[PDB]
Amino acid sequence: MANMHQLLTELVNRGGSDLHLTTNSPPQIRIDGKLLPLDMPPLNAVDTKQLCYSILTEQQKHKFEENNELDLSFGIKGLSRFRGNVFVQRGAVAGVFRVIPYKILSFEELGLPPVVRELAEKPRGLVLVTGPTGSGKSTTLAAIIDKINTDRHEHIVTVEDPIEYLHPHKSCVVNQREVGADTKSFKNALKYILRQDPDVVLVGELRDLETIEAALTLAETGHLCFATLHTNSAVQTINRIVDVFPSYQQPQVRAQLSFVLEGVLSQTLLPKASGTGRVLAIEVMVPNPAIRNLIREDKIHQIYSQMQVGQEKFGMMTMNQCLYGLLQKRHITMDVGMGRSPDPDELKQMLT
Amino acid sequence: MANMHQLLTELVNRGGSDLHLTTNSPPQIRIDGKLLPLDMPPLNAVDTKQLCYSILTEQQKHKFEENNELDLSFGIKGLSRFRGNVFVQRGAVAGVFRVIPYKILSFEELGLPPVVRELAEKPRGLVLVTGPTGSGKSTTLAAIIDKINTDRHEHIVTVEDPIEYLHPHKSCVVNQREVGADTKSFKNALKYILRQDPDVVLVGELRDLETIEAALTLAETGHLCFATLHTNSAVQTINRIVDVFPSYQQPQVRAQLSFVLEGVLSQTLLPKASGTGRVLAIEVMVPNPAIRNLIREDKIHQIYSQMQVGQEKFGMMTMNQCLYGLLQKRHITMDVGMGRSPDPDELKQMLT
Amino acid sequence: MANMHQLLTELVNRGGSDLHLTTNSPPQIRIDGKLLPLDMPPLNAVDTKQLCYSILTEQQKHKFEENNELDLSFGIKGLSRFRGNVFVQRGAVAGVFRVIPYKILSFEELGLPPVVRELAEKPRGLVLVTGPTGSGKSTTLAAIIDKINTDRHEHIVTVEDPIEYLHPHKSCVVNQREVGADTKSFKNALKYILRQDPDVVLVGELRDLETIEAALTLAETGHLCFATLHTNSAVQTINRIVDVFPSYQQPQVRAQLSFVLEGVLSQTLLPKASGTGRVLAIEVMVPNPAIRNLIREDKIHQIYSQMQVGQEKFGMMTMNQCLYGLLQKRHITMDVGMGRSPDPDELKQMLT
Amino acid sequence: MANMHQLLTELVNRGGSDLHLTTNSPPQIRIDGKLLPLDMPPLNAVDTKQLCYSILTEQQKHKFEENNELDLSFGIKGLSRFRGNVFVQRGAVAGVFRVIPYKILSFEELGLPPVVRELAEKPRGLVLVTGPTGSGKSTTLAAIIDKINTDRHEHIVTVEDPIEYLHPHKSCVVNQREVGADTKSFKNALKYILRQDPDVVLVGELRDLETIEAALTLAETGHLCFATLHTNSAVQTINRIVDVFPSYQQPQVRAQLSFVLEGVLSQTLLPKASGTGRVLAIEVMVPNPAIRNLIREDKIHQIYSQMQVGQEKFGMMTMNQCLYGLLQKRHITMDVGMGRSPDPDELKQMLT
Amino acid sequence: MANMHQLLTELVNRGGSDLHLTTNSPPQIRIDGKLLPLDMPPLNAVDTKQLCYSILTEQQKHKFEENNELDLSFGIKGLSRFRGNVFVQRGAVAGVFRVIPYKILSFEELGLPPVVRELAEKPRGLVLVTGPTGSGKSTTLAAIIDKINTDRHEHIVTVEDPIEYLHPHKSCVVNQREVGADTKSFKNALKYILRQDPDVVLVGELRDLETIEAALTLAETGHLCFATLHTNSAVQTINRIVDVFPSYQQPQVRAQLSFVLEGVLSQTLLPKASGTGRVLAIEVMVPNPAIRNLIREDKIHQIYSQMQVGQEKFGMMTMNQCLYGLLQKRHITMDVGMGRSPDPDELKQMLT
C-alpha cells in the first residue's frame, strides 16, 4: 500500500487533478487536464488489485468483486480525501482517483466574483453550478457551503454517493449522508429529509425527474437547496429541465421554477494561457422579475439577452463576457474563447 | 437517558422549536428558527446511539438499524409529546426532535382570527392549512380539532405517520391511528374509514393523487376532512392540486373542488420584529360562489383578486393584507414583509 | 360478551343508528346522527378486545390481528343483524357497529313514493340509489329487493363485502354471496355470475371502472342490476360515471347508459324538524327519451331541467322539490333546505 | 484444435474476411464477400464441437451449452484476434469467425481521406461511422483510436460486447471493458464511466434510446464519444435517430444533436472492379452551422444538398461523389455505382 | 407405428395435402383441400396416443403431456418430411400432419413466372409471399431458397418453429435453426444473427412488430430477408404492416419500406377446374420508384392501379389478372374467379 500512498502523495504534491491506474501502463496522472505517465514499471493485475485492496473493507472488496465496479470515498489522515472508482477492464483491476482537499478555497482564491458570496446569504431557493465532471463544481459548492457553515446557525444536510468534501461543524450543524450506507437511497433520504428540520440541503446530481420534484419541493418549503447539472449554459439547462417533464406539467414547472429559482451557473476549468495551472470560465445567470416572467411564459430563448445586460444590475455574465474578462487579463488564449464563443465576432468586438 | 431528558427539558423550558443531535457537535437547539449550540461536549456516535436507544423498543431499535431511518413519536409523562426522526450520517447516529405540547393553544393565543373558529362549526368539507414544515400546521389543526372535540358529539378520526398531537375525548369520540402500527397504510386506513362511521377526519399529508381522491370522496360523502399541504398560497395550491391529475380529469376535479372546498389557508411562522418569539403570517381564502365559479371555470389567476376583496364579507386575507396588519402592529419588520410582498409598493400603499 | 349484548340491545332499543367503541371513552351511540356517551366506565383495550373477540371465529381473530382491520357482518338470533368494523387506534382495539333490522320497511313506512314500487316491477336495467354512507341505501335497496322476492318468480343474486340485509326466499330464489368467503372477489363473482342464470343482481359499491362495465353488461344482457354510489345528484353522478372512462370510450358509455339506465336516486337521511327521528330527503331522476338523448349527446347540464319538469309525467323530483314537500309538511327546517338548495330563492318561491 | 488453427491460418493467409463452420459442408471461407468451400471433408457435429470447444473455458462451454449461443472474442498469440459466434442449427454446433488484425491500418492504407485524421484531433463530440456489419467500421474506428492513442495524453475507454480490436497503451491510457465480464452491462458501464475520468469513449452499438441519451450526455460533458450504426446515409441516420425518441423530446434531441454532433460517415466495403480485393465506398457529412441549423429546425431533407456542396469547404462527400471518385479511378464498376446512385443520371453527368 | 407409416404413405401416395387423426372417426385425409375418410375403424384415444407417441422422444412425450399441445417436425428416411401438430380434444389425443417433400419443385413446375427466379438473384431486400396456411408459401419460399443455394456462394440462415423444408448444402452454406432447440427464441436468434455473417435469411412468420423491425434491419443491413404473412393482397399487406406501428413511427416505416421492399406476393392454392389437383392463383406487386413514392407518401390505395399497369414493365399482376390467365387457360372456374374478383365485370371485360 506504500506505493499507493506515494502515488497519491505525488498527485497531491504535483497539483495533479486525477490519478489513473491500469495494467500494462505505468501509473499516469492527469495534471491540469493532461496525462503524464509516471517513470514507473507498467502495472499488472496483481499490482492494481493489491494496492486498491489495501484501502478496502472486507465488504468493499466483496462489493467490487461482486460487481467489478465500486464508487467510494476515503480520507488519508493529515493529507486529503479522495474519491475513487475501481472497475475491471480486460479482466484486470483498474482505478481512477480524484483529489478532495481538506481545505476548501474561497471565492477570490477560486476567481469567483463576490456575488456568489452574497448568494451564500440567501435563506432559501435553488442555485445551480453546472459543468462537466471535475469542473470544480463540488469544490465550488463546498466553498459556498463552508461559508454558510461558518456564518449561519442553521442545519446543513448533504446526500452524496459518495460523500466527497467534508464540512465539519462551524456555526451550523452539518450532517453528511452517504447513499447506500448512511441512507438506503436518494429516494430514502428524501423520504426522511423533511423530518430532520433542515435549512440547507445538498442533493447531489439531478439524476431524474423525481429528484427535480424533490428539489422544487425543498426550495418552495423554506429550504436552501443545492444541486448540480452537467449542462453548459442557462438556456440549455432550462430547456433540459423543462423537457424532462411530461408536456402537461411543464406549465407548472415553469411557474414553480420562476418562484424558486435563485441562480444558474455554468462553469468549466480550462488550461491557463500561461501553460501552468487551470482557470475557471463561468457563465452566470441571476433571475430577475423579467427573467421570472420569461420562465413562466416559456420564452426561454430571450434569456440569453438578459444575461448579456445583467452585468451591472445583478452581476450576470454570459460565457462570452467571461471569456472577455479572461482574454483581456490574458488568462485564456484567443483560440479557446473564440472556439467556444457562439459569436466569435461578438467577442472580438467586446475585446477590441 | 437522563442526559436526553435534560436536553428535551431544556428544549421545552427554553421555548425551543427543535433539538438537533449529531456527532462532533454539541447538542444544538433551534429556538425561534435559529440554532444555538449547547455548552456541552461534542457528541460521538456512542452518545447519540445510547441516548436515542434509551427511548426505543426492541422493534424500533431493530427498525432503525434495519433502515438507518426511523420516524416516530413518543410521550414524556407529565411533560410533552415529541416527534422524532433518527437517521445515520457519516456512519453515526443523528436525531432531530420536534415538540408537541400537551396543551393546544386557542385561536386568540395563536393570533388566529375568529372566522377559523366559525369554520370549526362546519359539518363537512375540506379546509386546508398549508405552509412549510413546522409552521404550526399540526398545532393549528389540533386547535380546530380540540375545539370540535370539545363542542361536538361526533366521531373524529386521525390517520398519522406518526401520531403527533393527542386529542383525548371531550364531547367527541376521537380515534387516532398511526400508520404502520394501528393501520397498514394510509391506503388501508382509507379502505376501512368509511365503515367506521366518521364525521371528522384528519388525513395527514396530501402525498399523492389517490389521497386527493380520497379527500374529495370524504368531503362529498358527508364528512369533515382535514389535510395539509406545503404550498404557500391559495392559487399556488389550486394549480398544484389540479395539475396532479391527468388532463381529462381536471374538469371533474374543478367541479368537485368547487363543491367540496370550504377553505384554503397558507401560513408561516416568522421571527418577531421584537427579536423574541415568532409570529404567524397567514393568507386566508374562503370560497364564495364567485370563487366556486372560478374553480369550475379554470379561471384560477383572478382568485387572488377575490381574496383582496373578501376581507369584509368573508374574512378573507391576502398575504400582503396579513403583512399589513403585522406591520401596523409592528409584529414584523418592513424588510420581511416587503421581501415577500408580490407587490411591495402595494403593501407600502396599504401601510401609508 | 354479555356487556356487548346489552350495548347492541340498547342500540336497537334506543333507535340508535350506530355504536362506537373505543378506549378511554365510554361506549357512545349515534342516535339520529348524534353521539351520546353511555353512562358507563371508559373502555380499555382489554374491554374492547374481549367483547369484540367474543363474536369472532378463530380465523376472524387471526384476521384482525393479522391486519388490525376487519369488516364483517353477523346476526344475533331473534334480534337483528349487524355490520361491524374492527380496527386499531393508538395501539388499542376499536369497533363500530351498524344495525341491520330483520324486518325491511316498506316504501310508505320509509316515506318513499309509489313510483319506486312500480320500478320494482321492471324486468331489467340499472336503477341507482345514492347518497353518503348509512343514508338508508342498503335498507332502501333491501326493500325493493324484498318486494321483488315477494312478487316475482325470479333469481336474485347479491354480492356483498360483507352481506348485510338477508333476504330469505319468498317467491324468488335468493342467493347472497359474501366476497372473500362465498366468492374470491367481486371480480370472481362476475366471472361466474352469467353461468348462474340470474334475473336480478345486487353488485354492491361501484368501486372501479371494471365494476361499471360489469353493470352495463348485466343491464344490457337481460338482467336487473342494482348498484350504489356515494354521489349526491343525478348530474354529479352522470359526470362522475362518464369521467371514470378513457375519453375514447365515453361515447360508447353514453350510448350504453342511454340504453340501460332506468333510474337515478340521490338520497340522504336528515334529522327531523321535530327533533326526534330522521327523515329522508331524496332527488329522483327517471330517464325519458329526451333524457336518453341528453345522455347520448353529452348534454348533461340540462338534465336538471328535465327533473324540474318530470314531476307530473314520471314522478321525477329535484332535491329542491323534495325540500319543498318536506318544508310544507314541516318535516325539515328552513335552514337545512336552504343551506342545501342550489337556489334558495327558488325554493322560497316554490314554498310561498 | 490443430485443424482449427489451420483454418484460421488459411483465413488470415488468404485475405479472407470470415470463416463459416457447419455440419455436412466443408469449412467455407468468405473472401472479399464470397464463399469458397475448402477442399476438406464435410463437417459433422463432433468436428465442430471439438474444434470450437478447444478454444473455450469451462464457463464458455457451459455458456454455449446453456444457451446454444455464444458471442466471444479471443486472441491467437503472434497471429491475430478473432471475433467468434457459436450457435446451434439442426441440432449441431456451428460457428462463424471474423478476423481482427493485430495491426490497424492507417487512413491512406484504407483509402480514407485526411479529414478523418483531422477529426481525430477533435477533443470532443460524436463522430459516427456507419454501414452494415463487417464494413470496416470497427477497423476504421480502431484506426482513429490508435491515432489518438499515439498522439494524445488522454484517457480512452471502450465498452464492447465483446472486445474486438485491442489498443495497447501508446500516449494515452486505454482501458477496454468487455460487457458481461469486465462490466455487468452497457448500462453498468455507463453507471461508472463518469467516475473514471475519461476523455475518449467507444460505446459500441447504439442499441437503444438509453444508449443514445448516454452518448449525448458524454459528448456534451466534455468527452469524445465514438459509436456505430448500421444506417446507410446521413439523412437516414438522422431520421432514424430522431424518430427513436418520443415526439415531445425530439425538439431537445435536435438541439442537442446540433450542439454535440461532429460527423456522420456511412461506409461500405465493395468488391473491387479488378476482381481482387475490396474497396471502401463512403458518404461523408461534416456539420456546418447551416447544417446545425437544419438539425435544430427539423429540415432534414435538405441536408443532402449540403453534402453535395461541402466538398471544397469541409471535405464532405455524398455517396454519389464517392462513386464518382471510385469510377474515374476504375475502383468500382459502373453497374454497382449506378445501382446504388439515387440519381444514376446525376452520377453519369458527374463522370462524363 | 406401422399403421401410422401406412397412413402417411397413403397421404404421400395419394397426393394428399394433410392427414387428420382424431377419435371416433377413421383417419381422414385432405386431398386438394377436401377430406376423405379412410376405410378404417374409428380411432380411439389409445390408437391416436400410441401411433403419435411412436415418433416422439421422451422429452416430446413429456412436452405434449405437459401442455396437451405440440408443434413439431420430423423426417421419414427415404420418404418425406412432415410437420405435425398434436393436441387434445374431448380428453383424447388428436393430430394433424402436413407433407414436406424432399424435392422442392421449380417455378415452372409450380406455374410460377420467371420473374421470381430473377428476384432470386437479388442480393438483398425483403420479398414477401403471403396467403393462408398451406397455400404453398413454405414450398415457394423453399424453391427460391434452393435456387439461391444452388446458384450462390452465400450464407443462408433459416429460423423456424419448427424447421420444415430442409435445404442441404449446394453452393451456399445453409444453416437451419429450430426455435426452442437450436435457439431459445426468434428473439434470441435475432440476438445472434448479425454475428453469424449471413447473406440470406428466412425469418418465419411476421408475428409481431419486433419481428418487423428485425426484418427492416436485416434488409437494410445488406442481407436478403425472407418472411411470410397471411394477408391476401399487397394493399391489405401494406396497410396491415403500417398500422402495427405507433402512429409516430409509421412515417419512418414508410421510408424504410420504400427503401428495403423488393416484392409482395399474395398467393393461394385453389381446386383446379378439371376437378383433379390444385392450381396457384397469385397477385404480384413489384415496387417501382413510383410505388416507392406511394409508400413514402402514405398513398396506399392507388397502389392497386400500379399493379394493374405493371404487367409489361415489371411482371406485376393483380389477382384479377391472374384469374384472367387461369380462366382463359381453363385452370379455374368462372365462379371462383368472379366470386373473388373485386370487380367481376372488370374480369369479364378482360376475358371477353
Ligand SMILES: Nc1ncnc2c1ncn2[C@@H]1O[C@H](COP(=O)(O)OP(=O)(O)OP(=O)(O)O)[C@@H](O)[C@H]1O
Ligand atoms: N478555481 C479552480 N481552479 C483550479 N482548479 C479548481 C478550481 N476549482 C476546482 N478545481 C479543481 O477541479 C478538480 C475537480 O474538483 P470538483 O470535484 O469540485 O469538480 P466537480 O465538477 O464537482 O466533479 P464531479 O462532477 O465528479 O462532482 C479538482 O482538482 C479541483 O481542485
Ligand SMILES: Nc1ncnc2c1ncn2[C@@H]1O[C@H](COP(=O)(O)OP(=O)(O)OP(=O)(O)O)[C@@H](O)[C@H]1O
Ligand atoms: N402561533 C404560533 N406562534 C408561535 N409558534 C407556533 C405557533 N403555532 C405553532 N407554533 C409552533 O411551530 C412549531 C411546529 O408546530 P407544528 O408541528 O404544528 O407545525 P407543522 O407545520 O404541522 O410541522 P409538520 O409539517 O412537520 O407537520 C412548534 O414549535 C409550535 O409550537
Ligand SMILES: Nc1ncnc2c1ncn2[C@@H]1O[C@H](COP(=O)(O)OP(=O)(O)OP(=O)(O)O)[C@@H](O)[C@H]1O
Ligand atoms: N326512511 C328511513 N328513515 C329513517 N332511517 C332510515 C331510513 N332508511 C334507512 N334508515 C336507517 O339508516 C341507517 C343506515 O341504513 P343503510 O345501511 O341501509 O344505509 P346505507 O347508505 O346503505 O349505508 P352503507 O353505505 O354503509 O351501505 C339505518 O339505521 C337505517 O335504519
Ligand SMILES: Nc1ncnc2c1ncn2[C@@H]1O[C@H](COP(=O)(O)OP(=O)(O)OP(=O)(O)O)[C@@H](O)[C@H]1O
Ligand atoms: N479499407 C478496407 N479495405 C478492405 N477491407 C477492409 C477495409 N477496412 C476494413 N476492412 C475489413 O472488413 C472486415 C470487417 O472489419 P470490421 O469488424 O472493422 O467492420 P465492422 O463494420 O465494424 O463489423 P461489425 O459490425 O461486426 O462490428 C475485415 O476483414 C476488415 O479487414
Ligand SMILES: Nc1ncnc2c1ncn2[C@@H]1O[C@H](COP(=O)(O)OP(=O)(O)OP(=O)(O)O)[C@@H](O)[C@H]1O
Ligand atoms: N403450385 C402448387 N401446386 C399445388 N400444390 C402446391 C403448390 N405449391 C405448394 N403446394 C402444396 O401446398 C401444400 C402446403 O405447402 P406449404 O407448407 O409450402 O404452404 P404454406 O403456406 O407455407 O403453409 P404454412 O402457412 O403452414 O407454412 C403442400 O401440399 C404443397 O405441396
